[PDB]
């Protein structure tokens, strides 16, 4: 009671001091700085590749590290790797939960990873001796479904979950080495820095946190949304990260200054973002909608520079190869495309 | 994985049998398969090839018409029919093992064998040496040749390379000429261009003593090549 | 074409085959029923051992050549609205109720009740952007209870603007109408009620009868004649 | 009145062929096969639109009755023309057979069906068309008239007192009076499966669904012996009495055909777009 | 009286985000505007590339 309130109010006090030290540096607006620069030019870019074998609606899809291979996860119970350069198929891995929401590729090329609202992680070996593809072990422990996984190393694995909390997990052994928890609300997308020793992860409260992989210890909060937040990545510079959310709106966040950047919003669209990725150099930035469509902005003057029109349901995955060289976009017909 | 050949024996010109091969530790019915002649104290050769689910069937112009190949899924067998033996049909049959995909080792697996006594444009075959006296603990480069240039447009050169050991069958060293095989030493290394090629060994120890031959995949008609003994 | 190596044509007779086995995996998966099976709780969703046999749980079960996948959502306790869209193509949703116990006026939040809550999430469930034209099949309870607590306690008044009283068939009757009549669509999406009783086969024939009217339905709207 | 003939000819062409074309694109533009119905739709669609092609080849028979083409034009025409109707035909019943295999057996015979059998049935429906469309009426060639200028009519074999009423009971048989009755067993037996359906599990709207299944059969049926029916009738009857050739005689047969060719434009305004194509066009 | 551990270490979070160092926006802007510059030249994306060096320029067949 008189505690509690006290503790509220010390709380609350905390906050003020928090507002109040970061609105001292907030002395000059980036576009007002980016006027000077020369816009890019209206990009229009065609389809060059269409992949179909799928029955169901497409989830998620992930690069290969040489940018030729990539893996897209169904809600037909298949794990099919393709080969973007000539179409084949070079992989199907059938699963033992129909469900799924999420898939990984792991950095060496020896893994695939996937899972979703079963609850539990599953890691499969693609170099076997035997000639076929065997589920190497069953990451268990997590109470809500999942939701994002990424390699972080071969031997490590990071997921966030819809219980609220992301878990590092040891795969030699399999059990949590470290657990994150704070977040009020659903965890629902994460992405890794470069360099492996931070990452970030966007919860339905509309806050994203800054995570340690080290010590597992929170280290920044970014507010600024106003409804689920469902996209995240880093910037390639790996000081800045640009977040989606359902009020029709992209943002972008500085790391070294706590502040906020940009945002990407148009009278035009009303609609939900479902992936947001960036590209080689960091110019333009790719944001998927629901409304059948992709748009490509420019990350400097929040400009419309092009669009991208070639599905006729919902996108609901997106990626870019490590060289810059195409773009990958995945949706609810069951069709996969790469454009140039 | 384990391969076991079947129906050896001595045959008679106006004779007939039925090779046998079972294949067990492994997806058998995910994989290519090869036959390869090796005459005694000469090189090896390759005879027939059936593909996976039996949609591709090829065979050599030395025995075309005259042997049939064919595949028992459920059962894991595969076998060789043959109508007409001549004098030239003494060798020492081998059943090979191997799978197509992007970035897959074919050839990877050549199976413990068997044998078989019968009494009595393509590219070429050809090596500069035939033997080497070598010592261990220096270097040995080895150097194979053909008549056209095995590069594709795409980027790909198909140079085999692989050793036999007295008393075993051989194993797969390199394979596109720029890998190494798995569980292969890193002593080992291969390179070339165009048509020239090599096989360096940084290390050479009493395990490394044997004959080497190189293969192209440029064409179906597979080619061998001929051997570099070297002699402790 | 012709340009390919002879690895090439290896690779594409590989992905061949696959594709073959995916379409012919695909073809199977087709012409299998789905229900989603939901319930307050101890409305009876456990009661499937016995009724129909002889993380997200799944059963399977086959009724006179006919293949049945049975989904229980209940254990989740998650967000809906996040994974509620993963049900987008399922058939005739099963909503598993027990309102023989109204009169017993509990929430576990001392303030609500069980009646109240179960037509709000019916409501809920029935008017998504999602789940139209998907029919819902009504299980009520056990009727005995119902008998045996109707009689002594005249409880039942305290619904609102009620008549009669105390006659089992005018109070099953007028909770059916309460639910039937909960439906905003009421032209493109339809309603089965039915009663459980103890016998074991009562409970399948009409699950049977209800997804092939289902199945009939569809392929009348997707042959033109509708 | 001719002339007026012409231009009901120029102008049923124009319709045919402009709502066949739009029902092909669309399907092919959009639809890629999405279901066997709309396989059959094509089917039906891509016979229907050669028939438009024809009929302006056909106007010079109408108008200026002499034949300038030749025998190769026209016995292509014919051959065409006779292809074409019996696979629209063919087609037809096929919808029908594949509609009451859908519904009334979906357990049981509809898991068959369904997968890939539809494109083995287009080939044997163009081969069996085929196979009785060009033994018989390839015997066609010009033969002289009493006005004097060539015209394009089937050439009279020998003994052709009994050959041509065997050709038209012939082509009675196969034409209409076979797939009267499967239409009719299959519809029927769909209004029955509804109606017991409904009636075995208690439905609120049963009664509102079985109204519009009566009624678009009802219309199927009609629009087809509407348009199927004369030229039949008129054959038999002019074969039974003879009957002098007259203005009247020539001016009404032209209407016969004229209704006879207008199945094909009906068809695609009423299967098509009545259907769940509505939404999608 | 269960609530204040958690309430406590809430604030004791809270009081350990505030000692962190940081810097002007302009800056930061800059600073992402010379590496956008930068790294300008060898994007596919940004400057198109003739056909010689694409490999997934769509072919006849
Ligand atoms: N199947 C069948 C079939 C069955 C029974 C009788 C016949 C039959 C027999 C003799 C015909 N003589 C001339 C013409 C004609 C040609 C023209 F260029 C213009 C024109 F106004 C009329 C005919 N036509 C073309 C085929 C059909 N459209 C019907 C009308 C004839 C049709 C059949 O063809």
């Known amino acids: 009671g008189s505690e509690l309130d006290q503790l509220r109010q010390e709380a609350e006090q905390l906050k003020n001091q928090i507002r109040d030290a970061r609105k001292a540096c907030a002395d000059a607006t980036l576009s007002q700085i980016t006027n000077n620069i020369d816009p890019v030019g209206r990009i229009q870019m065609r389809t060059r590749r269409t992949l179909r074998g799928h029955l169901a609606k497409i989830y998620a899809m992930h690069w290969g590290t040489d940018s030729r291979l990539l893996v897209s996860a169904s809600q037909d119970g298949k794990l099919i790797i393709w080969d973007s350069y000539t179409t084949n198929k070079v992989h199907a891995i059938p699963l033992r939960s129909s469900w799924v929401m999420t898939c990984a590729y792991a950095p060496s090329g020896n893994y695939v990873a996937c899972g979703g609202l079963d609850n539990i992680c599953s890691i499969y070996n693609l170099k076997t001796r035997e000639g076929n593809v065997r589920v190497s072990r069953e990451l268990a422990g997590h109470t809500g479904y999942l939701s994002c996984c990424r390699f972080l190393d071969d031997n490590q694995i990071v997921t966030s979950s819809g219980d609220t909390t992301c878990a590092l997990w040891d795969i030699e052994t399999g059990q949590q080495t470290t657990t994150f928890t704070g977040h009020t609300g659903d965890v629902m997308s994460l992405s890794l820095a470069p360099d492996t020793r931070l990452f970030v992860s966007g919860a339905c409260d509309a806050s994203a946190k800054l995570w340690d992989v080290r010590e597992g210890m929170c280290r920044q909060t970014f507010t600024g949304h106003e409804s689920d937040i469902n996209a995240i990545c880093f910037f390639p510079n790996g000081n800045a990260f640009a977040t989606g959310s359902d009020d029709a709106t992209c943002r972008l966040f500085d790391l070294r200054a706590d502040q906020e950047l940009m945002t990407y919003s148009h009278d035009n669209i009303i609609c939900g973002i479902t992936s947001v990725s960036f590209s080689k150099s960091g110019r333009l930035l790719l944001a998927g909608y629901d409304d059948f469509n992709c748009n490509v902005w420019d990350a400097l003057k929040a400009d419309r520079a092009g669009v991208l029109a070639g599905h006729d349901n919902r996108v609901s995955c997106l990626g870019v190869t490590d060289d810059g060289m195409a773009v990958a976009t995945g949706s609810w017909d069951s069709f996969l495309k790469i454009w140039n | ?232 | 074409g012709c340009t390919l190596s002879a690895e090439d044509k290896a690779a594409v007779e590989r992905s061949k085959m696959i594709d073959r086995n995916l379409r012919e995996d695909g073809e199977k998966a087709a012409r299998e029923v789905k229900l989603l099976l939901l319930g307050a709780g101890e409305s009876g969703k456990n009661t499937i051992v016995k009724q129909m046999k002889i993380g997200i749980v799944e059963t399977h079960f086959t009724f006179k050549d006919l293949h049945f996948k049975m989904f229980d959502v209940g254990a989740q306790r998650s967000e809906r609205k996040k994974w509620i869209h993963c049900f987008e193509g399922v058939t005739a949703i099963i909503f598993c109720v027990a309102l023989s116990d109204y009169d017993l006026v509990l929430a576990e939040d001392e303030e609500m009740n069980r009646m109240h809550a179960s037509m709000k999430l019916f409501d809920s469930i029935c008017n998504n952007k999602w789940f139209t034209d998907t029919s819902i099949i009504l299980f009520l309870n056990k009727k005995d209870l119902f008998e045996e607590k109707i009689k002594k306690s005249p409880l039942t008044i305290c619904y609102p603007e009620y008549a009669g009283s105390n006659t089992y068939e005018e109070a099953a009757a007028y909770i059916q109408c309460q639910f039937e009549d909960l439906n905003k669509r009421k032209d493109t999406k339809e309603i089965y009620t039915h009663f459980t009783c103890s016998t074991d086969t009562k409970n399948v024939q009409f699950v049977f009868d209800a997804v092939t009217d289902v199945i009939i339905k569809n392929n009348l709207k997707d042959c033109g004649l509708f | 009145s001719n002339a007026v003939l012409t231009f009901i000819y120029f102008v049923v062409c124009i319709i045919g062929l402009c709502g066949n074309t739009l029902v092909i694109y669309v399907i092919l533009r959009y639809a890629k096969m999405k279901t066997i119905t709309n396989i059959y739709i094509l089917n039906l669609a891509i016979a229907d639109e050669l028939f438009m092609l024809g009929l302006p080849f056909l106007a010079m028979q109408v108008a200026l009755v002499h034949w300038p083409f030749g025998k190769a034009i026209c016995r292509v025409v014919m051959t065409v023309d006779g292809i074409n109707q019996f696979t629209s035909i063919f087609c037809l019943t096929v919808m029908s057979i594949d509609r009451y295999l859908a519904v009334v057996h979906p357990i049981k015979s509809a898991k068959w069906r369904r997968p890939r059998t539809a494109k083995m049935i287009t080939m044997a429906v163009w081969g069996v068309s085929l196979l009785v469309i060009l033994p018989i009426m390839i015997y066609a060639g010009l033969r002289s008239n009493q006005w004097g200028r060539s015209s394009c009519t089937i050439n009279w074999p020998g003994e052709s007192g009994a050959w041509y009423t065997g050709f038209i009971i012939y082509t009675f048989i196969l034409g209409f009076l076979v797939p009267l009755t499967i239409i009719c067993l299959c519809y029927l037996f769909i209004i029955i499966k509804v109606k017991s359906s409904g009636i075995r599990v208690g439905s609120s709207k049963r009664k509102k669904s079985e109204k519009k299944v009566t009624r678009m059969v009802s219309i199927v049926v009609a629009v087809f012996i509407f348009c199927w029916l004369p030229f039949y009738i008129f054959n038999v009857s002019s074969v039974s009495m003879a009957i002098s050739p007259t203005p009247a005689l020539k001016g009404m047969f032209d209407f016969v055909v004229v209704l006879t060719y207008a199945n094909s434009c009906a068809n695609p305004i009423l299967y098509a777009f009545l259907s769940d194509n509505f939404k999608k066009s | 009286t269960a609530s204040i551990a958690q309430a406590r270490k809430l604030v004791e979070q809270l009081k350990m985000e505030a000692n962190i160092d940081r810097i002007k926006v302009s800056k930061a802007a800059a600073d992402l505007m010379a590496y956008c510059e930068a790294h300008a030249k060898e994007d596919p994306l940004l400057t198109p590339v003739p056909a010689s060096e694409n490999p997934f320029r769509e072919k006849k067949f």
């Open chain 2, 1 to 232: 994985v384990q391969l076991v050949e079947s129906g050896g024996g001595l045959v008679q010109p106006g004779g007939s049998r039925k090779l046998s091969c079972s294949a067990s530790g492994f997806a058998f019915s995910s994989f290519g398969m090869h036959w390869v002649r090796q005459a005694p104290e000469k090189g090896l050769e390759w005879v027939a090839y059936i593909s996976s689910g039996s949609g591709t069937i090829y065979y050599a112009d030395t025995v075309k018409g005259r042997f049939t190949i064919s595949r028992d899924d459920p059962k894991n067998t595969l076998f060789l029919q043959m109508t007409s033996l001549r004098s030239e049909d003494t060798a020492m049959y081998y059943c090979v093992r191997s799978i197509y995909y992007y970035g897959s080792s074919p050839f990877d697996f050549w199976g413990q064998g068997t044998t078989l006594t019968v009494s009595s444009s393509d590219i070429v075959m050809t090596q500069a040496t035939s033997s080497v006296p070598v010592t261990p603990g220096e270097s040995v480069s080895i150097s194979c040749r053909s008549s056209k240039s095995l590069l594709h447009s795409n980027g790909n050169t198909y140079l085999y390379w692989f050793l036999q050991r007295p008393g075993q069958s051989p194993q797969l060293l390199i394979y596109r000429m720029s890998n190494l095989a798995s569980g292969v030493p890193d002593r080992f290394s291969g390179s070339g261009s165009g048509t020239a090629f090599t096989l360096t060994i940084s290390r050479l120890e009493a395990e490394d003593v044997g004959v080497y031959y190189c293969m192209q995949h440029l064409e179906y008609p597979l080619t061998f090549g001929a051997g570099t003994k070297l002699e402790l």
